[PDB]
Structure 1
Amino acid sequence: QEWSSTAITDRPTVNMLGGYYSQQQFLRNLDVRSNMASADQPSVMDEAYKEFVMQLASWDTRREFWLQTDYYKQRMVGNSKADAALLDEMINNIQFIPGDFTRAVNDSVKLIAETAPDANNLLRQYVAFASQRAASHLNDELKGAWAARTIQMKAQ
């Protein structure tokens, strides 16, 4: 049947970043009064969006998403070879197209399914799935830099 769906995304806002925005700002300011660092750096919203795009187009993210989607578990024959062949085909059903900033084109993602209600229901869950992984990755980065700065200050 091969029904389709589409979505387009852009950078988040300061309001939707929650309390992560303030703490990231605090650490950057330490790096500019001391350490003689910092430059015309990209904003906090820019680096957060860059992480999200990486997870969206990752081959590992698509494989993980299908393994718990309850739409693929029903189409499980039971043979190991058949299941692996089916899973590979469904991974290729998600396509990511990077955008061009000079032509005013944004990033888009497209999904293909077997039924019209399934086409948009699955696409909504996938975008939420990829966003949660990026949020968790950013928290670990903040923790790592926070502990490194404490060690440096404690010694000085």
Structure 2
Amino acid sequence: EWSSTAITDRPTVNMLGGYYSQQQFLRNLDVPSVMDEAYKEFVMQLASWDTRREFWLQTDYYKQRMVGNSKADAALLDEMINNIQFIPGDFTRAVNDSVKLIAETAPDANNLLRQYVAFASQRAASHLNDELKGAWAARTIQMKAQVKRQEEVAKAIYDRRMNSIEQQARLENLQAVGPAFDLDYDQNRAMLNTLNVGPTLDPRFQTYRYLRTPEEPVKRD
């Protein structure tokens, strides 16, 4: 009976909080914008069948209209799932991504659309933190193993030199100074320290901006 509409675009840097500096951090360890990737996920949460379904199942609107029949509630549920509609933008055309939500009332249409949007976005944020955490842990690990191989290189060299000095002061010097470590290793060690701190996983952050905010439609559908 009534529908609201939203039009969206990619989040601002500020909207990603620590995730941004953390994702860039991880990006700038491996060598399309971070915000681009984020919005990619938002669009994906926003479009999901699972997401709409869970939303309605979680919605009181749906619940007060429940009659206690599994088939009817699932038809109604499916219908409500169907009452949320995403249209991908055409950026060749300045048509942006946009979403509409139908309910039996205008206030229901607006508020429900708002709640749905916040819902999809939370799922997106949560998933990007899983991604981040899983990128950080791994980076901490590659460095630990790398640093470790480096320690093994210095150790083989050290032993060889030892054995060459053997066959007298510099034998004692080498013996007490230990293996020789290049700069790369210590750098790897301090990065390892920061990595070992482990990521700040802020679940809050936002994953989209509005170009058109849902409003109470001024007329019926």
**Fold equivalence (TM over 0.5):** yes
Unaligned runs of 5+ residues in structure 2 are 144-218
Moved over 2 A (4+): none
Instruction: Give the aligned length.
Output: 146
- TM-score, normalising length from structure 1? 0.88
Identity, in percent, stands at 99
Report which stretch shifted further, 78-87 or 121-130. Answer: 78-87
State the 1:155 CA deviation. Answer: 64
CA offset digits 1:111-141 (Å, max 9, x no partner): 1111121111111111111110000000011
- TM-score, normalising length from structure 2? 0.63
Name the CA shift for 1:155/1:137 in 2 (closer, same or farther; >3 Å): farther
State the 1:84 CA deviation. Answer: 1.5
Q: Is the 8 A contact 2:101 2:113 kept in 1?
A: yes
Report which stretch shifted further, 146-155 or 102-111. Answer: 146-155
Name the CA shift for 1:155/1:5 in 2 (closer, same or farther; >3 Å): closer
Distance 2:48 2:127 in 1: 14
Matching residue within 102, 106, 130 for 2:96: 106
CA offset digits 1:53-83 (Å, max 9, x no partner): 0010101001100011111111111122221
**Match of residue 55 from structure 1:** 45
Q: Which protein shows a greater Rg?
A: 2
**Match of residue 23 from structure 1:** 22
Distance 1:52 1:129 in 2: 10
Distance 1:31 1:117 in 2: 48
Are 1:81 and 2:96 an aligned pair? Answer: no
Distance 1:72 1:149 in 2: 45
- What's the RMSD between the two structures over aligned residues? 9.1
Unaligned runs of 5+ residues in structure 1 are 33-41
